[PDB]
């Protein structure tokens, strides 16, 4: 009965540190049945848009678990593991008439009383400090 003829926006939540549990890689499943609802015909609209949260599950799901334990793809030489989650989503419609808006939620994303302009002026602290050199 989800009758509606323009859509032009959906929003369904795909999880980033979710690749390691299956029995067979259930992100490559999810990124396959990714396939069957964008390219679809009366899916078809003016764009997509789609929320990659858990961002912060990064650096305590890369160490143990690197990203090649069931993906034989990656060759990057960390930030290039979602950044690759998100190539391997981009490059599944094979047309340009849904161009793909992408938005990385984070967890700092609900305070903004200099939050996250704390973490930017800490970044910046660091790459003032890795400016420096033994002089």
């Not at 989800?2 to 939540?13: A, G």
């Not at 890689?25 to 997509?48: C, D, G, H």
């Amino acid at each position: 009965i989800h009758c509606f003829e323009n859509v032009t926006s959906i929003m369904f939540l795909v999880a980033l540190s979710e690749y390691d549990q299956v029995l067979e890689n259930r992100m490559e499943e999810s990124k396959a049945l990714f396939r069957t609802i964008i390219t679809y015909p009366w899916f078809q609209n003016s764009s997509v848009i789609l929320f990659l949260n858990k961002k912060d599950l990064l650096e305590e799901k890369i160490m143990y678990s690197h990203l090649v334990d069931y993906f034989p793809e990656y060759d990057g030489p960390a930030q290039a593991a979602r950044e690759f989650i998100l190539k391997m989503f981009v490059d599944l419609n094979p047309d340009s008439d849904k161009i793909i808006y992408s938005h990385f939620t984070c967890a700092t994303d609900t305070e903004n009383i200099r939050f996250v302009f704390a973490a930017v002026k800490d970044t910046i602290l660091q790459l003032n400090l890795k400016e420096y050199n033994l002089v």
